[PDB]
Structure 1
Amino acid sequence: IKAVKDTFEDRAYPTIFYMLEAVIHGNERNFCALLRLLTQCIRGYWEQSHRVAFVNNFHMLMYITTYLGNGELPEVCINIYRDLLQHVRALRQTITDFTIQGEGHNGETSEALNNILTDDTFIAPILWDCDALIYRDEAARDRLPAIRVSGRNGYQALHFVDMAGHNFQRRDNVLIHGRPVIPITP
């Protein structure tokens, strides 16, 4: 804990890796192709400083931990990740068995009133795909959706754009879904 606190307080982590991860998060095929270089880069980073990092990408962390099933790296960062996952699982188990459910008028409300985070009404730090918004809209049966994006009642929905649609002279245009490798589907 103190090691990661010192690493965070050192203020020596470049943002180029974070930007690259954010760019590649929307392409599963590209991420799989670049994993070969990513493993070498993380091995070099560990050799330079065994202190753990890259805690802002839970999906990437779980993917690399599941892929690194051979044992090519020492069980230090992997051990810390496993301990954190075990603690999270224990907290989830205590939350689930410390309360009861079953009562409901027209939707799921017990967990929403208990912890809030289970329901989709709670906000999120950064949104990546439209599947979360679709799930929130589907689960918001008892709540009227007051969508007021830039004063418009409805929000624009479109798929990924091609290479000829990279014009920067557009206003109020969202970028959802994508082409990792097709209609809109979560």
Structure 2
Amino acid sequence: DYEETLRLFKTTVTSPNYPELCYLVDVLVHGNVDAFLLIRTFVARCIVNMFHTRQLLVFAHSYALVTLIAEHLADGALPPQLLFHYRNLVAVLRLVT
């Protein structure tokens, strides 16, 4: 069962309220690992503050961002539910492959 996480992802993607910086940070991170490691606090505050103020989660659009969130941000600095959502997405990819 992943229908709830996929439903939330659908709400995020088909929403014009997607925050501008999410693209900009996707470009500057460039999918580079330690580059994402250096920006950990900013993305952690951004995802919790966004999810609390608006239900749609952020940085779901780019695969590199999703994978780097799921691995390196998992160490902490995030309430477990959002990390669990991202891990469920990555597990959905693993099930598909």
**Same fold per superposition (TM over 0.5):** yes
Count of residue pairs the alignment pairs up: 92
Match of 2:53 among 31, 48, 51: 48
Q: Which runs of 4+ in 1 moved over 4 A?
A: 26-30
Q: TM-score, normalised by structure 2?
A: 0.63
RMSD of aligned C-alpha atoms?
2.8
Q: Deviations over 1:14-36 (max 9, x none)?
A: 33330232133176554433222
Match of 1:10 among 8, 15, 22: 15
Change (3 A) 1:29 1:48: same
- Indicate whether 1:88 and 2:86 are aligned: no
- Indicate whether 1:77 and 2:75 are aligned: no
Percentage identity across paired residues of the two chains: 23
Give the Cα–Cα distance (whole angstroms) in 2 for the partners of residues 21 and 67 of structure 1.
Answer: 15
- Unpaired runs of 5+ residues, structure 2, are 1-5
Letter in 2 for 1:87: V
- Unpaired runs of 5+ residues, structure 1, are 93-186
Determine which structure has more spread, i.e. the larger CA radius of gyration.
1
3-state SS, counterpart of residue 39 of structure 2: helix
Give the Cα–Cα distance (whole angstroms) in 1 for the partners of residues 34 and 82 of structure 2.
Answer: 26
